[PDB]
Design an enzyme around this catalytic site. Structure first.
Site, PDB file in Angstrom:
ATOM      1  CG  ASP A 101      -0.717   4.759   4.081  1.00 24.35           C
ATOM      2  OD1 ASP A 101      -1.179   5.347   3.075  1.00 24.35           O
ATOM      3  OD2 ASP A 101      -1.363   4.707   5.143  1.00 24.35           O
ATOM      4  CE1 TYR A 144      -5.352  10.596  -3.081  1.00 25.28           C
ATOM      5  CE2 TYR A 144      -5.027   8.402  -2.205  1.00 25.28           C
ATOM      6  CZ  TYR A 144      -4.889   9.756  -2.084  1.00 25.28           C
ATOM      7  OH  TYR A 144      -4.276  10.277  -0.968  1.00 25.28           O
ATOM      8  CG  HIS A 196      -1.919   1.111   1.240  1.00 23.25           C
ATOM      9  ND1 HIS A 196      -3.052   1.034   0.493  1.00 23.25           N
ATOM     10  CD2 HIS A 196      -2.007   2.288   1.963  1.00 23.25           C
ATOM     11  CE1 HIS A 196      -3.791   2.145   0.701  1.00 23.25           C
ATOM     12  NE2 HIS A 196      -3.173   2.893   1.619  1.00 23.25           N
ATOM     13  CG  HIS A 209      -7.813   3.776   2.715  1.00 18.37           C
ATOM     14  ND1 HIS A 209      -7.862   4.733   1.750  1.00 18.37           N
ATOM     15  CD2 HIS A 209      -6.453   3.548   2.972  1.00 18.37           C
ATOM     16  CE1 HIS A 209      -6.590   5.052   1.367  1.00 18.37           C
ATOM     17  NE2 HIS A 209      -5.737   4.322   2.114  1.00 18.37           N
ATOM     18  CD  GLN A 257      -0.400  10.398   0.670  1.00 12.69           C
ATOM     19  OE1 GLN A 257      -0.011   9.790   1.639  1.00 12.69           O
ATOM     20  NE2 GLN A 257      -1.690  10.518   0.388  1.00 12.69           N
ATOM     21  NE  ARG A 298     -15.100   9.319   6.761  1.00 16.79           N
ATOM     22  CZ  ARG A 298     -15.874   9.693   7.777  1.00 16.79           C
ATOM     23  NH1 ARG A 298     -17.055  10.289   7.582  1.00 16.79           N
ATOM     24  NH2 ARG A 298     -15.443   9.491   9.011  1.00 16.79           N
ATOM     25  CG  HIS A 353      -1.481   6.775  -0.994  1.00 18.55           C
ATOM     26  ND1 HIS A 353      -2.381   5.967  -1.565  1.00 18.55           N
ATOM     27  CD2 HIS A 353      -1.723   6.736   0.366  1.00 18.55           C
ATOM     28  CE1 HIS A 353      -3.175   5.444  -0.596  1.00 18.55           C
ATOM     29  NE2 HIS A 353      -2.764   5.919   0.572  1.00 18.55           N
ATOM     30  CG  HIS A 363      -5.126   2.057   7.596  1.00 21.21           C
ATOM     31  ND1 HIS A 363      -3.793   2.182   7.728  1.00 21.21           N
ATOM     32  CD2 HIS A 363      -5.511   2.924   6.567  1.00 21.21           C
ATOM     33  CE1 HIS A 363      -3.338   3.093   6.845  1.00 21.21           C
ATOM     34  NE2 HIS A 363      -4.393   3.534   6.116  1.00 21.21           N
TER      35      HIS A 363
HETATM   36 FE    FE Z   1      -3.470   4.907   2.375  1.00 26.10          FE
END
Ligand code: FE
Ligand code: FE
Lengths: 449, 448
Positions: free
Chosen positions: A320, A121, A56, A232, A61, A210, A58, A269
């Site tokens: 992550d 994403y 996992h 997630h 980041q 969500r 991204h 998570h």
């Molecule tokens: Fe994440």
């Protein structure tokens, strides 16, 4: 042609073995022989272990790593993280995204991770309009992984809403958004791009409960029924509370009740679970996608690790947020979170064994399952993905002691790393580190100016 | 006077740029800002103060990485004590010096410029004193001298195996003294440290379990102007046993029965009420925090925000010496808080950098706990400092450099000076390989 590594010790699925000859052919492990002398042309290594999946990530980041540690004036202590994250997310170009992802994957390879699960994403252009090539940003990930020689399980993210019950997505999320139709077309662009990417896996990543409605979740997870699904879930207490208010159910519970959850699924998570959710998750076979360093950096909470393991649950690790890249860092943080919470030592050891052994074996095993590569590992017919450790400071250390020295005491480090039989890292250095770094510093300068 | 020019240097009142630091006789003689380097200046990018490692048990460095097997016991702490006592009960003075040397090299390479050696391995293997009473302390001093590491030596007073003056058990035989023999040992240490430039000699009552109130009075009066260090409230079981003995927890007990001040460093102080925490801070005692060891031992989480809001000061120590790193310790401290409070940037000061606040804090409280309040990047201080490799953060401002170092792995220690002598060059101590050979030989002997 056929090439051989000879390891004085190698950690095979049924345990440590000595004097292990590993044959490689067409990037695959063609043979493993134990208790044999090195052939005259064998490349000699001291200690060889399986490559670790980084399940996992991204990638973008990584550009903000070390920049979100200033408190700022907000009453909300998470504001600064979101502000920095959206500054990067909303301005990054495809050229920059490739540069950042490359330097990240080099860092992961140098840390002994041989595959990445890119939970992707960052899709559309800065104003939220699709690129002329719909999958542009995913293509950049794949180009970066190819250049790095990093294995890729690409998990394009489905994201459509800003809250439970299908709340409209806000304008800050504009580069992440798709409907199921445009998402299927993006997945198709990714499939074409990954043709000829040896070993690549393409799955789907509904962002979170969500961000996706139940109907959208059904559509997305039916697109590629034989490939992974990542999501997630239950990362922060506020999500659990909101999920309860919306449905009367907690997140993992809700997911297990509304989807056919299996080993195809990786729940990222899964930090806040009841004892019943933990057991049901494990029994369903879903892999826990643990991100211990990021979870600490974000103050998320502590995973129900002993209960999960006792119920037969399997896990992997992911960098992550990509704030800090390391197998030792992640596994140590996982264990230590447990030691502090339970006031005990060697919490995640199996039987009376080594804690480093249990964690390392577990994370390789669950990681490869989450990545859609259960055939992988130090096994005949697996991809030739593995890591040698520098044991200069552990000269007589027999197997498990090497892992504990590496993970807890800083007494070993990654030496060589192979992916599909190609040595990408030598003596701790990736063959393209300096070039990747120059391009990364240029992109950073542009983003921070 | 010889000169280091730093593009950025973190002075007590903040980052300064283009800083020329003049050094003579191992001490800082001048600091000038905003200037170019003179032709003979040594050039550095980013310079910060040396960090005190305010709590160390040198011999435990030998067991690092060896206590991570669960074993057959219902008591999950058994394996740690079994390994610890195997090393403690068999180590010779020659082996102790080798271990301490290699440790102090590791500390220097991590940017620690002084060590607070909380020293309890005193007597021979059978518990009989050595012909030279302070033999083992002399080995610590010799190792520190060979490394060029600063030393605040804290010989430990230990006399009992349980609250209320229970007899010491056989496993504790190398640790024990009565006050009279302890005073003689301190005297041996004082003589040994003559000519050890910058050395400090304090005392270390082991814990409230290991000392009686009368012994505590005697030991803490021996050197009234020097530091006092003591383990307190590290584990819930000590706290419960202290309550069973006195009706009080360890820190509240100590604050009520001793005149605790900034002379005192209370190690761990992990289990305190909010009122104890405030009283400790108000007294001025330094929290000797050992975050990595506390995590490795499952001790608990320090009451950091309350302590800091009450004006409490702290330093960091490697303690068990299982893993040596400034970033490792400060990160673990902050992260222990993030998980406990479900928040980020918990130990930041004002709206600042968390790495900045933690680094400044640990240097400041550390030097006070070491008996060296004059130290730091100041005129008159020992020339003890560290340059950071900022190749991955090439023009980044100072605080950004600290956060990168501490949280993101983006900077590392380059050079390290102690008393103006460069002991580490591009991350490497000159004696690393030689010290390592002697360390592995000792380890092989100990593990045979
Ligand atoms: Fe994440
Ligand atoms: Fe200690």
């Amino acid at each position: 042609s056929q090439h051989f590594i000879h390891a004085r010790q190698a950690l095979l699925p049924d345990g440590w073995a000595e004097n292990v000859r590993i044959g490689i052919a067409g990037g695959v492990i063609c043979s493993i022989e134990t208790g044999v002398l090195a052939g005259p042309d064998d490349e000699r290594q001291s200690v060889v272990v399986a490559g670790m999946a980084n399940l996992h990530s991204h990638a973008f980041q990584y550009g903000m790593a070390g920049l979100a540690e200033r408190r700022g004036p907000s009453a909300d202590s998470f504001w600064s993280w979101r502000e920095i994250m959206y500054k990067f997310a909303l301005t990054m170009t495809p050229e920059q995204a490739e540069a950042v992802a490359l330097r990240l994957y080099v860092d992961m390879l140098e840390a002994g991770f041989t595959r990445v699960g890119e939970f992707h994403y960052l899709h559309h252009d800065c104003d939220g309009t699709p690129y002329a090539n719909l999958s542009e940003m995913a293509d950049r990930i794949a180009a970066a992984a190819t250049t790095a020689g990093m294995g890729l399980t690409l998990l394009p993210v489905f994201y459509a809403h800003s809250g439970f019950g299908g709340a409209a997505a806000n304008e800050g999320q504009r580069r992440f958004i798709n409907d199921p139709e445009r998402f299927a077309r993006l997945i198709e662009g990714c499939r074409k791009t990954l043709e000829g990417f040896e070993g690549a896996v393409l799955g789907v990543a509904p962002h979170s409960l969500r961000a996706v409605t139940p109907d959208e979740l059904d559509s997305v997870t039916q697109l590629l029924p034989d490939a992974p699904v990542h999501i997630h879930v239950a990362e922060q207490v506020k999500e659990v509370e909101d999920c309860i208010a919306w449905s009367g159910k907690r997140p993992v519970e809700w997911l297990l009740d509304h989807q056919d959850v299996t080993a195809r699924w990786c729940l990222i998570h899964a930090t806040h679970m009841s004892d019943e959710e933990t057991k049901h998750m494990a029994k369903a076979g879903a892999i826990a996608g643990l991100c211990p360093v990021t979870e600490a950096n974000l103050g998320d909470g502590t995973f129900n690790a002993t209960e999960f393991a006792a119920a037969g649950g399997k896990f992997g690790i992911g960098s992550d947020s990509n704030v800090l890249i390391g197998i030792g860092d992640e596994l140590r943080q996982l264990e230590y979170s447990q030691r502090l919470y339970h006031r005990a030592r060697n919490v995640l050891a199996a039987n009376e064994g080594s804690t480093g052994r249990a964690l390392f074996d577990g994370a390789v095993l669950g990681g490869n399952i989450a990545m859609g590569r259960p055939e992988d590992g130090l096994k005949k017919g697996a991809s030739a993905d593995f890591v040698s450790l520098d044991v200069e400071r552990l000269p007589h250390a027999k197997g498990d002691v090497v892992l504990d020295g590496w993970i807890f005491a800083g007494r070993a480090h990654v030496c060589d790393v192979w992916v599909r039989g190609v040595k990408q890292v030598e003596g701790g250095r990736h063959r393209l580190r300096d070039e990747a770094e120059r391009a990364f510093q240029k992109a950073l300068g542009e983003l921070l100016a």
